[PDB]
């Protein structure tokens, strides 16, 4: 810390920055797509139509212009104003709205872009819990723009901030492209969490599922299936702080079942570590049978009224009680083998004797 300027950092000023300044490039990031294109067989030279979303201030557009065919159609879309560039059509509009669709359709008369390359990023400094997710949302929006402007067997290049919602983007990319692979060029300083994923071989389906590109359920969370085993033996373990919310259908945060349900269940470990109480019915014939036992006494019922203050020595006792309650409620083949073995032994002995005949030369 120290509230120092970003330009005063140790790695903020780099050889790539000065190289871009010397070359006329507007950013060192222009070198990234320079190296990535050099990794995948110069796919910009074979594109002839380029769409660059979030291209402030046009470094990637400059690289495409210098690499793509002379009269190509590099089109840059931005939310902030962009300095005009020769032979590049740049305009300002938010990509997450129908205004961008209308403007792109106006500019995309009939051609379909052979490549879409996206390098958007939010204003980092919010906390990285929202920055990574909003960058992933930006990448998904860029994919939604690209899917309707890419020919079959197209290339889509995007930058993702690595986070928990990154494998989901990779999976979604794999469902729409032939080969999906992530990489990190040298001019992507190794302190950064950005990773550049490129996907080639656009499938271009006739009837694509819109819900596959809808963030409402692309970023759906996953459930848990923990064993719930340490809660019986390691009760005083100071369990990991429960900071993952509660169940959707849980309001009292409390559970209770009949003791006979515990007796008849197949999983006692799961039920002991989840319930808060086992209910006793005093007008049930099964409980009438189970009451007149050597068990169900000597501090057993009190351990049942609260399954959260027991410990291993009491859980084992309850399990033993449940076990008690459940208990209450030919010659020719041998001759052929001998013959073949005798033949093999005779042959081996003959060979060994013949060999020993000739080891005194």
């Amino acid at each position: 810390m120290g509230k120092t300027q970003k330009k005063n950092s140790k790695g903020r000023l780099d050889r790539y920055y000065y190289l871009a300044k010397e070359k006329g490039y507007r950013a060192r990031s222009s070198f990234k797509i320079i190296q990535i294109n050099e990794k995948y067989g110069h796919f910009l030279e074979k594109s002839k139509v380029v769409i660059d979303l979030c291209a402030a201030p046009g470094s990637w557009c400059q690289v495409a212009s210098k690499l793509c065919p002379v009269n190509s159609l590099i089109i840059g879309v931005d939310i902030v104003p962009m300095k005009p560039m020769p032979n590049v059509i740049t305009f300002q509009s938010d990509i997450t709205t129908e205004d961008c669709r209308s403007k792109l359709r106006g500019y995309m008369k009939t051609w379909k872009a052979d490549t879409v390359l996206h390098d958007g990023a939010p204003n980092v400094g919010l906390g990285w819990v929202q920055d990574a997710f909003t960058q992933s949302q930006l990448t998904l929006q860029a994919l939604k723009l690209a899917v309707e402007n890419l020919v079959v067997n197209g290339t889509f290049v995007t930058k993702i901030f690595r986070s928990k919602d990154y494998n989901k983007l990779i999976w979604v990319f794999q469902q729409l492209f032939e080969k999906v692979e992530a990489t990190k060029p040298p001019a992507s300083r190794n302190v950064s969490a950005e990773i550049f994923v490129v996907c080639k071989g656009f499938k271009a389906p006739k009837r694509l599922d819109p819900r596959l590109l809808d963030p409402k359920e692309v970023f759906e969370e996953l459930p848990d299936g923990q064993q719930n085993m340490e809660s019986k033996i390691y009760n005083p373990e100071k369990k990991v702080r429960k900071r993952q919310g509660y169940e959707e259908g849980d309001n009292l945060l409390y559970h209770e079942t009949s003791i006979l349900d515990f007796v008849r269940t197949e999983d006692p470990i799961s039920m002991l570590g989840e319930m808060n109480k086992f209910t006793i019915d005093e007008n049930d014939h099964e409980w009438k049978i189970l009451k007149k036992l050597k068990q169900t006494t000597d501090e057993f019922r009190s351990c049942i009224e609260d399954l959260k203050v027991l410990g291993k020595k009491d859980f084992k006792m309850i399990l033993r009680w449940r076990k008690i309650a459940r208990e209450i409620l030919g010659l020719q083949e041998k001759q052929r083998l001998n013959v073949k073995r005798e033949r093999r032994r005779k042959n081996e002995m003959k060979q060994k004797e013949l060999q020993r005949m000739q080891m005194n030369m």
Binding site: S65, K66, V70, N71, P86, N87
Partner: peptide, 28 residues
């Protein structure tokens, strides 16, 4: 010669230049 200037980034048709990224007066 047209291909060389095209590689340099000069859009020319038979030869007159429409638009060049770099000046033609210094292009070898």
């Amino acid at each position: 010669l047209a291909q060389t200037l095209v590689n340099r980034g000069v859009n020319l048709q038979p030869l007159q230049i429409f638009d060049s990224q770099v000046p033609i007066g210094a292009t070898p």
